[PDB]
Design a protein around this ligand. Structure first.
Ligand SMILES: CCCCCCCCCCCCCCCCCC(=O)OC[C@H](COP(=O)([O-])OCC(O)COP(=O)([O-])OC[C@@H](COC(=O)CCCCCCCCCCCCCCCCC)OC(=O)CCCCCCCCCCCCCCCCC)OC(=O)CCCCCCCCCCCCCCCCC
Ligand SMILES: CCCCCCCC/C=C/CCCCCCCC(=O)OC[C@H](COP(=O)(O)OCCN)OC(=O)CCCCCCC/C=C/CCCCCCCC
Ligand SMILES: CCCCCCCC/C=C\CCCCCCCC(=O)OC[C@H](COP(=O)(O)OCCN)OC(=O)CCCCCCC/C=C\CCCCCCCC
Ligand SMILES: CCCCCCCC/C=C\CCCCCCCC(=O)O[C@H](COC(=O)CCCCCCC/C=C/CCCCCCCC)COP(=O)(O)OCCN
Ligand SMILES: CCCCCCCCCCCC(=O)SCCNC(=O)CCNC(=O)[C@H](O)C(C)(C)COP(=O)(O)O
Lengths: 178, 111, 459, 220, 67, 124, 128, 104, 175, 88, 62
């Protein structure tokens, strides 16, 4: 959710993802810890059996058969973490995340409360306004003429700058705002 | 006169008081959940009486108090039925609701 | 009843004689006072109508419509003083003049005792609405919309005039009382069939019917806020009032002649309810909801039973109020975002809670929640149709489900979810918008307290 | 009505005996109970259905509250595969859930007896559809089948939750509410059943293999 | 009361909750046993089921295949 | 169950029809049948307002039980003899119905066997 | 070995079961690189406006405007009367009307015939 | 829209849409508050077969049990006054056919 | 009370049984009723007494309007608009009164159903018969007029009914 | 009440607790900055198992992307800290 | 102030409802209707004073 993706997934990445999915679904099937450890060790041995294969065609065929077998033997109701895309509390707190710019519309009587917080917010706004031009200049200098080739972004290079496009990453509301 | 009607209507009327008070300076404080729980408890213990009257004498009633509108030969009025089913299910529902609100005072403490 | 007509003709020059920064205040105050005065026509005899003079009379069907129009004008004035802030004084006065003229024509339309005068004013209402739509719109399509809104009306209403004068050459009078007392049956002949069609088609296209509804989405979308209010709240009810007044002479030809129109109304109500689901725009959804409700009203008028008439009157009033409120709610978001797309601004409940409450109440009253007058009218119409035929309920039932769906769909799309992450100009709601919402919604509940005022003469 | 109730209760119990989300299990449980209520209505026993409503409210609400307490204790976790041994970690909720489940299954003298036993007896001795009766009996068995699944996967065995233990139930509000509903689900059936007038002709002459068939299917 | 986490240790219990749970389980079992002792019929039935085959032919009013 | 198995899997003509029953005269094999006695009159049952299904030949014990329950209200455990009497009367009615069912069943089978024997005798 | 999974319109094929990804080729790698470049350029164009402190307003998305225009106003200019369109329009716009007319006419004719005979049990039908 | 990757940093996380990319013609139908086309653990034309078989078998078994009902070996219930003629509707000026029940 | 008339809305003599307790346990509903009386019924009675005292110091009368009898539509000339207007007004008043009569009968029937408890099917079938007669008469009077009803339409329907009755009687006399 | 305000010290302590308890790592040789491939001798499957163990310990799932690039305990604790919004 | 909640949330509403039911709802016919109380053989009616007869001396068996 943070690192920019690539144009494709390599064979190693695909087999690692299959291994993780298989272990998760096996843990879903084997509720108890000892049985899960037994069958996870068996699964690890099964994966390690073809660890040093160098025939790429054979490795691809093995991966295809393994994924077909996994899809046949997948758990219809796999365990999902509560805050995962399928969890029971996936987007539960999205209704409490208010964006920061809303504070700009507060009444002066409301801003009379919390003076120090608004002073700090003013300092942050001044910093962002000062750094924006250097950010955009660095972005326009560090890119090929045909635009960016990937979604990754460069860091701050000299001591006086901040990483480009940092405001909306740093000023996320919270994990649990209210 | 015949406290059956008065109590049966009161147990439903006093449930609406916190809804009317949802605008006063009690809805903006932290005492509102306890206020609603206490109101439900009082409603339940008040509704326990018509149940006793029914289990004693088997008394049932209909109260057509407000005449809403009449369309030709049809008449539509605010009528309440206080037979066995109503006077038996009201206390059970109020008891369950009181328990659920007391539980929610703890389960929803961080909302 | 000149005590209501004259104050509007005095609202005109005082609007034209006001200061540059005091036109809105005077207009709003005196329009509210005129509405309060017009609230005195609700005292209706159960025997017959109030006949003030030889030209103007008031019935139990006319009074709620008059009150609705007189209450509408201040709301339109309140909603119009936001996008007209940058306008010049003369053009603001011209806009208020158009609104005042439209209200005056509507008031004189709803109480004219003679059919030719009623037609004259019911057509005079076209000019101010067309001027408003084609002059104070926003997009380039408004002109086209105006053209439609004109011709779809006129091509349906020019034959009616001929029929009217023909009636005056045969019966000898066009006064409503004489027409009702001296009414005689119409024989089954091609001449009488075409007379029926001529008398019916104008009010059918003014509802509009399912096959003749193409002008309504254009007119309601490209018009300004006040134009949409007046179009969807009162200007649609002109066809229903005209049909309820004119069906007296059409019997017994109506029973044979109503089959195609009833079929069209039912199937088009289903079709427009289904269309509301797959809509990318926000005002078009409300326009098609208006089409569905007016199709239900058409069915009620066509089956021609007292319960159907009561339900038709109640549904007309309730739909006018609800559609006006929905259009205002959409206009607030349009002013915030400067776009009409529904999925552009999302999750507005976390930013505008009170507006979310207003949206919820409007959506609830749109899907006929009991005991609101919307459900009263809908249920009376449904019962009358069931008496007419036991199969009709199926269609009606289907509509109900679809109705709720799309209503909640809108309420879920614009209010719930997460915000768009890149619209940072959603300022807190002003007092004017909240006051407009409250003045829209409170009369609905106050009327559902005492429904007999809006049930028409058949009560 | 009888056919709809029978198919509903059987299908819902069959779906319940497999679910892993505890709230889903109790939701299918109450759906099956509603199906049984409609079965009771279909055999012309409305007062038995009303009594079943009154009895079911108590222990079903208590079961939901116990499930909610378990969920809140384990950092909002609802899958029974990640809740291990709570028999001793949460004693009061364990007792409440056990009592509520026993009342739901038709323990011969709890609040669920004076309703479910009479309903089953009335279904057995009525001119009804045979298939509906068979589905009702199978659903009665599946009720205990999913109840013991809840108990076994939620309170027995070894822990499976995250190592950081935050299990704490020493809060007077939760204890008092669960205690009130527990007293209700223990005594309200006997209190109510003995205080209402007879609204139906009771089934008095029954074969022994049919009088106790509810207990037989529950134990099986 | 203040309860601290354990991190792979048994949670800190209290005497009050234990005695409450034990008392309620005990009273449930006592009520069950009391009701079974006093109203056993409600489980076992009160009146015997007659055997239809063991009814003599005369009380049902039939003739032995004669007329 | 066993009656259902016999009727649906065996011979249907040898078993009574629960819908149309009794199909034999009430005095076929009986020399005298005394009319069943009803204790409570219509007016008492109407005043007590029992039900339209509780107004059988057993209603007297039900009326007595309802009365004794009403006077002894605060203690609801004082009505055991009356409840037992009502249950016993219900049981007697049920065993009477079982007697009628069995009588009809064996009467039908005897009639069919006699008809078969007569046909076999007349075959010659 | 194992029962094959066949996709449908409402249950599509999983990515892990798609032969289209195991059959790698330099052309496919180039295509994926171009797709990633397009997505990255669009994301950069969005983010440059998104984090701009000066701008205050709605970021106008050309894609959304294009979608709404295609769904609303670009339909009639691209419409041609063809046998498929003509048949579909005639059916879906006339057939339901005639079907409902026939159904309601038959029901009302039966009801009127029963009324004329005098066998309908119309008692207590005070309200209509 | 449900099949789209949930862990990607979408510009619109709820709709799972990036800014500027082409939008599906039927997006409002696939907004994942609506019609879902995600892969299923059990293939289509197999869920349909199983569900249709279950419902058809249930309906057929209900019908066959309706014509093979279950009852108890008892006679019809007896009621004292001509099967409660006066209370089951009345008409006290017709003297209905007597219904006599005898002891057994 | 004395407000409504006891013959238009009749009720049975209200026979109620006497309390005959058979236990020494304190009956709780009696204590609760006494507490309710002493705590609620007395203050409201005093308030009503005060309000009636205030009302008695200023009493005025309102009179029920009595309408004359005007010629009906049968003796109205075809094109004489004034007599037709008078007949139409009288017919509408009669229609409203007829509807209120039906309302009274329906209220009687509802009281019948509620009061008789479980034996409602037999005790007050007389109210059912009265409602059947009243509903049949009202239907034969104003069944199929529809909206835009008038005295002329009712007269035409009545004329058709009398013609049908005359034809049926003449045909039956030829049997 | 609810969970205490988790801090960086607790996160690091728990991460080192689970890692040094792994049977493929010598408890006396691993440090905060100990790379898995370089100075611990592990392959990709072991790193996947370590990530799964972290997920089970902290009760949240790390996506497959952003988990391929957590190669030392410091990176894991930093990722958890960034996601859970801890101060100290 | 110990128990003013009862007098402000129970006593006042019950007073208002009792007044409204006693002097306004009851003033109209057929507004509050109670089912006729059950009469058993043996009870004596209050107003009339008559006593219902025993039900036919039905036979008992211990
Ligand atoms: C039966 C209840 C009895 C209550 C007694 C008191 C009744 C007072 C009624 C006042 C008039 C309605 C006002 C509506 C506009 C809202 C005003 C507002 O913004 O308040 C903010 C204010 C301050 O909150 P905030 O913190 O600023 O809010 C921030 C956010 O906006 C967050 O705000 P929020 O989340 O709090 O949202 C507001 C809240 C409430 O806001 C609303 O939804 C208002 C709309 C209500 C439903 C509208 C659609 C249905 C139409 C029915 C018409 C009935 C007419 C009755 C007479 C009405 C006379 C005005 O939302 C809801 O509660 C859910 C709405 C759906 C309710 C469903 C009810 C179904 C019908 C119930 C039966 C009705 C007849 C009963 C008798 C039947 C015969 C026995 O909070 C309130 O005042 C809440 C009002 C209490 C809720 C009333 C709900 C029931 C009302 C029914 C009508 C009245 C019945 C009276 C007769 C006795 C019954
Ligand atoms: C008589 C009237 C017609 C009868 C109704 C027939 C079906 C009507 C057509 C339904 C319109 C639906 C389209 C518009 C709504 C928007 C779509 C929508 O709701 O989203 C689908 C949404 C998402 O599914 P989830 O499982 O919750 O996904 C969660 C995981 N992400 O699910 C739904 O809401 C679908 C609901 C559709 C119900 C259709 C089936 C109903 C058929 C019932 C027939 C049986 C009748 C019972 C007989 C009783 C015996 C007398
Ligand atoms: C509260 C503060 C005030 C306390 C002092 C007052 C104490 C009681 C004295 C009140 C005076 C008596 C009184 O109420 O007058 C009756 C007066 C009207 O007389 P009617 O003839 O019965 O109805 C009009 C049709 N003819 O009744 C009232 O209006 C007040 C009480 C009505 C019931 C309360 C409102 C409940 C209903 C709210 C609306 C719900 C939606 C519609 C109902 C749907 C039903 C199908
Ligand atoms: C949004 C567009 C809608 C368009 C609606 C327009 C159609 C309106 C219906 C027809 C209107 C014309 C009817 C004439 C007006 C009534 C006058 C009348 O009744 O006189 C008739 C005369 O009737 C006619 O002459 C009618 C002729 C029609 C000519 C124009 C045809 C217009 C189109 C025909 C089809 C329209 C109907 C369906 C349209 C549906 C909407 C698309 C009697 O003749 P007499 O002189 O009295 O002699 C009889 C005794 N010997
Ligand atoms: C419950 C669900 C069903 C069970 C799931 C079924 C899955 C079946 C498993 C069978 C596995 C196969 O056949 S697929 C055979 C896998 N093919 C290969 O290993 C060839 C190339 N190997 C490498 O690149 C590296 O050694 C690598 C392994 C990536 C490690 O690298 P790291 O050092 O970077 O971790």
């Amino acid at each position: 959710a943070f690192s920019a993706p690539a144009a494709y997934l390599t064979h190693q990445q695909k087999v690692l993802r299959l291994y993780k999915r298989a272990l998760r679904h096996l843990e879903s099937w084997c509720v108890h810890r000892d049985k899960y450890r037994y069958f996870a060790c068996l699964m690890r041995a099964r994966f390690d059996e073809h660890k040093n294969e160098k025939d790429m065609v054979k490795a691809t065929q093995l991966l295809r058969q393994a994924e077909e077998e996994f899809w046949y033997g997948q758990h219809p109701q796999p365990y999902i973490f509560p805050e995962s895309p399928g969890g029971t509390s996936y987007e539960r707190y999205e209704c409490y995340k208010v964006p920061e710019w809303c504070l700009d519309d507060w009444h002066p009587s409301e801003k009379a409360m919390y003076p120090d917080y608004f002073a700090k917010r003013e300092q942050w706004k001044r910093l962002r306004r000062e750094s924006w031009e250097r950010e955009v200049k660095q972005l326009q200098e560090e890119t090929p003429p045909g635009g960016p080739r990937t979604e990754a972004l460069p860091p701050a290079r000299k001591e006086g700058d901040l990483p480009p496009l940092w405001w909306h990453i740093v000023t996320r509301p919270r994990e649990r705002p209210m | 006169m015949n406290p059956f009607a008065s109590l049966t209507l009161t147990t439903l009327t006093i449930l609406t008081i916190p809804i009317m008070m949802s605008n006063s300076n009690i809805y903006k404080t932290n005492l509102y959940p306890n206020y609603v729980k206490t109101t439900v408890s009082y409603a339940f213990t008040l509704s326990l009486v018509p149940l006793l009257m029914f289990m004693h004498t088997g008394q049932e009633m209909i109260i057509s108090n407000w005449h809403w509108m009449t369309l030709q030969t049809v008449e539509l009025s605010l009528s309440f039925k206080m037979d066995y089913f109503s006077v038996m299910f009201i206390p059970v529902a109020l008891f369950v609701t009181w328990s659920i609100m007391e539980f929610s005072m703890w389960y929803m403490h961080s909302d | 009843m000149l005590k209501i007509i004259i104050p509007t003709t005095m609202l005109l020059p005082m609007t034209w004689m006001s200061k540059h920064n005091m036109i809105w205040i005077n207009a709003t105050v005196h329009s509210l006072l005129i509405s309060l005065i017009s609230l005195s026509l609700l005292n209706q005899l159960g025997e017959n109508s109030l006949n003030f003079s030889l030209t103007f009379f008031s019935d139990s069907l006319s009074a709620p419509l008059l009150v609705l129009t007189t209450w509408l004008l201040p709301l339109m004035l309140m909603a119009s003083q936001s996008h007209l802030s940058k306008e010049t004084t003369t053009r603001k006065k011209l806009y208020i003049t158009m609104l005042i003229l439209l209200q005056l024509f509507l008031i004189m339309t709803f109480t004219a005792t003679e059919l030719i005068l009623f037609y004259i004013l019911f057509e005079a209402t076209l000019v101010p609405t067309l001027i408003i739509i084609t002059r104070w719109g926003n997009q380039t399509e408004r002109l086209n919309a105006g053209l439609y809104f004109l011709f779809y009306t006129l091509a349906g209403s020019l034959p009616l005039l001929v029929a009217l004068v023909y009636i005056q050459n045969t019966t000898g009078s066009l006064n409503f009382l004489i027409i009702h007392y001296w009414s005689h049956p119409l024989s089954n002949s091609w001449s009488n069939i075409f007379m029926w069609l001529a008398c019916i088609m104008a009010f059918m296209v003014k509802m509009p019917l399912y096959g003749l509804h193409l002008w309504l989405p254009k007119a309601h979308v490209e018009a300004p806020i006040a134009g949409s209010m007046v179009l969807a709240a009162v200007l649609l009810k002109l066809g229903g009032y005209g049909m309820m007044r004119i069906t007296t002479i059409l019997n017994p030809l109506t029973n044979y002649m109503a089959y195609p129109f009833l079929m069209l109304s039912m199937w088009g109500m289903i079709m427009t309810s289904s269309i509301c689901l797959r809509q990318t725009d926000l005002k078009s959804l409300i326009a098609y909801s208006s089409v569905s409700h007016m199709a239900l009203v058409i069915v009620a008028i066509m089956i021609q039973t007292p319960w159907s008439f009561m339900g038709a009157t109640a549904l007309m009033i309730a739909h006018g109020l609800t559609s006006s409120m929905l259009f205002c709610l959409a206009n607030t978001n349009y002013e915030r975002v400067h776009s009409r797309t529904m999925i552009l601004a999302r999750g507005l409940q976390t930013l505008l809670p009170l507006m979310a409450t207003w949206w919820l109440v409007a959506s609830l009253t749109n899907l006929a929640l009991p005991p609101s007058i919307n459900l009263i009218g809908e249920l009376f119409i449904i019962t009358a149709s069931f008496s007419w035929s036991n199969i009709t309920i199926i269609l009606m039932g289907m509509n109900m489900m679809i109705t709720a769906l799309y209503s909640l769909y809108m309420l879920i799309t614009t209010q719930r979810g997460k915000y768009t992450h890149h619209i940072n100009n959603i300022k807190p709601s002003f007092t004017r918008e909240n006051a407009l919402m409250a003045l829209h919604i409170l009369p609905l509940l106050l009327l559902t307290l005492n429904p007999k005022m809006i049930l028409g003469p058949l009560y | 009505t009888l056919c709809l109730g029978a198919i509903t209760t059987l299908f819902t119990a069959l779906c319940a005996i497999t679910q892993n989300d505890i709230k889903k299990i109790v939701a299918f449980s109450t759906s099956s109970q509603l199906g049984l209520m409609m079965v009771t209505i279909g055999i012309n026993q409305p007062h038995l259905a009303f009594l079943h409503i009154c009895m079911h409210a108590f222990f079903k609400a208590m079961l939901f509250m116990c499930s909610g307490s378990i969920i809140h204790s384990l950092n909002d976790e609802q899958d029974i595969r990640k809740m291990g041994g709570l028999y001793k970690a949460m004693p009061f909720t364990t007792t409440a859930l056990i009592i509520g489940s026993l009342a739901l299954t038709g323990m011969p003298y709890l609040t669920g007896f004076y309703s479910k036993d009479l309903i089953i007896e009335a279904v057995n001795m009525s001119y009804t559809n045979a298939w509906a009766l068979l589905m009702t009996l199978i659903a009665t068995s599946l009720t205990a089948a999913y109840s013991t699944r809840i108990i076994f996967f939620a309170f027995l065995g070894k822990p499976r939750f995250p190592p950081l233990v935050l299990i704490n139930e020493n809060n007077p509000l939760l204890i008092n509410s669960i205690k009130r509903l527990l007293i209700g689900s223990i005594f309200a059936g006997f209190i109510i059943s003995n205080n209402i007038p007879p609204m139906t002709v009771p089934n008095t002459t029954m074969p022994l293999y049919m009088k106790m068939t509810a207990l037989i299917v529950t134990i099986m | 009361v203040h309860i601290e986490p354990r991190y792979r240790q048994f949670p800190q219990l209290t005497r009050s909750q234990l005695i409450q749970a034990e008392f309620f389980s005990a009273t449930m079992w006592f009520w069950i046993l009391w009701r079974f002792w006093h109203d056993s019929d409600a489980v076992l039935g009160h009146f015997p089921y007659p055997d239809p085959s063991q009814w003599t032919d005369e009380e049902l009013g039939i003739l032995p295949d004669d007329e | 169950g066993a009656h259902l198995a016999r009727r649906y899997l065996g011979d249907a003509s040898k078993e009574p029809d629960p819908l149309r029953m009794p199909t034999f005269p009430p005095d076929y094999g009986f020399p005298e049948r005394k009319e069943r006695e009803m204790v409570a009159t219509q007016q008492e049952m109407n005043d007590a307002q029992l039900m339209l299904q509780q107004r059988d030949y057993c209603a007297h014990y039900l009326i007595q039980l309802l009365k004794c329950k009403r006077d002894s209200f605060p203690n609801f455990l004082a009505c055991k003899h009356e409840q037992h009497d009502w249950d016993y009367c219900e049981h007697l009615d049920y065993v009477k119905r079982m007697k009628e069912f069995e009588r009809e069943r064996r009467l039908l089978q005897r009639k069919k066997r006699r008809e078969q024997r007569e046909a076999e005798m007349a075959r010659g | 070995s194992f029962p094959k999974y066949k996709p449908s319109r409402l249950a599509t094929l999983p990515a892990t079961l798609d032969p289209a990804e195991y059959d790698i080729s330099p052309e496919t790698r180039k295509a994926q690189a171009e797709r990633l470049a397009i997505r990255s350029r669009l994301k950069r164009e969005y983010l440059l406006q998104y984090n701009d402190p000066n701008r205050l307003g709605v970021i106008e998305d050309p894609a959304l405007i294009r979608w709404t225009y295609a769904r609303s106003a670009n339909i009639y200019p691209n419409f041609r009367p063809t046998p498929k369109t003509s048949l579909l329009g005639a059916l879906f716009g006339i057939g339901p009307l005639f079907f409902w007319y026939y159904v309601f006419k038959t029901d009302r004719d039966k009801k009127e015939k029963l009324i004329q005979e005098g066998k309908l049990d119309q008692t207590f039908n005070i309200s209509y | 829209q449900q099949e789209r990757d949930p862990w990607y940093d979408w510009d619109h996380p709820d709709l799972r849409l990036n800014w500027g990319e082409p939008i599906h013609w039927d997006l409002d139908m696939y907004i994942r508050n609506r019609v879902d086309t995600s892969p299923t653990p059990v293939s289509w034309n197999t869920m349909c077969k199983h569900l249709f078989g279950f419902v058809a078998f249930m309906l057929f078994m209900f019908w066959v049990g309706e014509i093979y009902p279950s009852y108890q070996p008892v006679g019809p219930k007896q009621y004292p006054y001509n099967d409660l003629y006066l209370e089951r509707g009345g008409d006290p000026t017709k003297e209905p056919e007597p219904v006599v029940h005898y002891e057994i | 009370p004395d407000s409504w008339d006891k013959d238009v809305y009749p009720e049975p003599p209200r026979r109620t049984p006497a309390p005959a307790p058979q236990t020494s346990l304190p009956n709780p509903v009696t204590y609760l009723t006494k507490i309710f009386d002493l705590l609620v019924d007395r203050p409201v009675t005093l308030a009503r007494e005060f309000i009636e005292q205030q009302h008695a110091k200023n009493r005025y009368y309102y009179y029920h309007r009595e309408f004359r009898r005007v010629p009906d539509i049968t003796e109205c000339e075809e094109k004489d608009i004034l007599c037709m207007f008078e007949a139409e007004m009288q017919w509408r008043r009669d229609y409203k009164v007829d509807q209120e009569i039906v309302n009274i009968i329906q209220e009687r029937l509802k009281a019948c159903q509620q009061r008789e408890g479980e034996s409602y099917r037999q005790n007050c079938a007389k109210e059912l018969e009265q409602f059947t007669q009243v509903s049949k008469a009202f239907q034969d009077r104003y069944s199929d007029l529809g909206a835009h009803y008038s005295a002329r339409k009712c007269l035409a329907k009545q004329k058709q009914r009398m013609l049908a009755e005359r034809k049926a009687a003449k045909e039956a006399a030829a049997a | 009440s609810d969970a205490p305000p988790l801090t960086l010290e607790a996160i690091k302590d728990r991460v080192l607790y689970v890692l040094k308890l792994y049977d493929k790592i010598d408890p006396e040789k691993l440090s905060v900055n100990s790379h898995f491939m370089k100075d611990l001798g592990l392959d990709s499957l072991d790193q996947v198992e370590i990530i799964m163990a972290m997920e089970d310990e902290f009760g949240f799932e790390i996506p497959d992307i952003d988990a391929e690039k957590l190669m030392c305990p410091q990176e894991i604790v930093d990722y958890i800290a960034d996601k859970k919004d801890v101060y100290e | 102030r110990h128990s003013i909640f009862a007098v402000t949330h129970v006593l006042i509403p019950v007073w208002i409802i009792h007044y409204y039911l006693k002097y306004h709802v009851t003033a109209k016919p057929y507004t509050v209707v109670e089912r006729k109380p059950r009469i058993f053989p043996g009870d004596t009616i209050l107003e009339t004073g008559e006593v219902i007869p025993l039900m036919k001396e039905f036979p008992d068996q211990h």
